[PDB]
């Protein structure tokens, strides 16, 4: 490859750094943390009841608004200290910087209010390895790697002060 993708971040109070990504056709846009400590893409679902606080005040992905979406439905779980996170697999087209990628990801249908209600961001994109990935779903950077469009199979972080 020859291209370099880059994504601007918002620094909320030296504790939360997040940037914009788009899912589907046309793109529905989300604020996410890029996590090297984790390996899955997770966003909130339109199936998340408004009775979940951690959802009501965040953005929700609606598959019913996307012409590119491809159903899977396999159920998947993650265990936090404060409770459990679950939802189901979906596939759609995700855009990060100038990069368009077909990707499997999670739609959350239930998550505890804490700490999730305190995020200014809507979800997470994991920058970790497949070994860690839940359901052994393929991580985003592996699919980016496979396209053959990056100058080098690296990525870097800059975080400002406040």
């Amino acid at each position: 490859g020859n291209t370099t993708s880059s994504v601007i971040l918002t620094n909320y109070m030296d504790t939360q750094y997040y940037g914009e990504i788009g899912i589907g056709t046309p793109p529905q846009t989300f604020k996410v943390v890029f996590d090297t400590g984790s390996s899955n893409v997770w966003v909130p679902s339109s199936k998340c009841s408004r009775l979940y606080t951690a959802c009501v005040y965040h953005k929700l992905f609606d598959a019913s608004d996307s012409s590119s979406y491809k159903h899977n439905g396999t159920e998947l779980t993650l265990r936090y200290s404060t409770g459990t996170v679950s939802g189901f697999l979906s596939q759609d087209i995700i855009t990060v910087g100038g990069i368009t990628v077909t990707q499997m990801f999670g739609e959350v249908t239930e998550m505890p209010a804490l700490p999730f209600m305190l995020a200014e961001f809507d979800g997470v994109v994991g920058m970790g390895f497949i070994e860690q990935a839940i359901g052994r779903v393929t991580p985003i950077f592996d699919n980016i790697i496979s396209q053959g469009v990056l100058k080098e199979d690296v990525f870097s972080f800059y975080y400002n002060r406040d």
């Binding site: 030296d14 390895f129 080098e152 972080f157 800059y158």
Partner: protein
């Protein structure tokens, strides 16, 4: 002011200075490297033999194990609150450096890099950017270097050579 930046497929020289010092992963499967010591002042108080350093862009803080943290805070002189550690705001700037031994270099965070200096008064408490976190196997037990650390050192994650790269950040 730019809050931050993530580059895919390279780095950005405008946001660091120097060249990278690179370290190999204990094992592929996790962005985790070896750490040879944690120092308070110019003495090597903690993780003396060797410990594990998880390099976590998705965390707010530096995190150590309970054991490690009690010992770091004790050395600093901090009071433990329910969810955090605090010092009297007036002695926040009098705080010693904390140094990390990674590869062939000491990585030095100062008082200004790890204390939330909201006041300077003797009658106020100031929060530190360092918390306890017990992580379970096979990834845990480990240290974890989150935003606190990444603010001072610009970080390259290199998948071709399974190595992580450091450089002093520019602001």
């Amino acid at each position: 002011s730019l809050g931050g930046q993530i580059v895919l497929g390279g780095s950005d020289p405008q946001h660091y200075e120097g060249n990278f010092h690179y370290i190999n992963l204990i094992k592929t499967g996790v962005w985790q490297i070896q750490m040879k010591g944690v120092s308070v002042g110019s003495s090597t108080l903690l993780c003396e033999d060797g410990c594990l350093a998880l390099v976590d862009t998705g965390a707010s803080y530096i995190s150590g194990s309970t054991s490690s943290i009690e010992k770091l805070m004790e050395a600093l002189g901090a009071k433990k609150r329910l969810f955090d550690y605090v010092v009297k705001c007036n002695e926040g700037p009098t705080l010693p450096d904390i140094s990390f031994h990674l590869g062939g270099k000491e990585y030095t965070l100062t008082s200004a890099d790890y204390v939330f200096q909201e006041s300077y008064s003797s009658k106020k408490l100031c929060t530190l950017a360092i918390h306890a976190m017990d992580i379970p196997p096979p990834t845990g037990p480990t240290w974890a270097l989150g935003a606190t650390f990444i603010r001072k050192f610009y970080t390259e994650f290199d998948r071709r050579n399974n190595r992580i790269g450091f450089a002093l950040a520019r602001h």
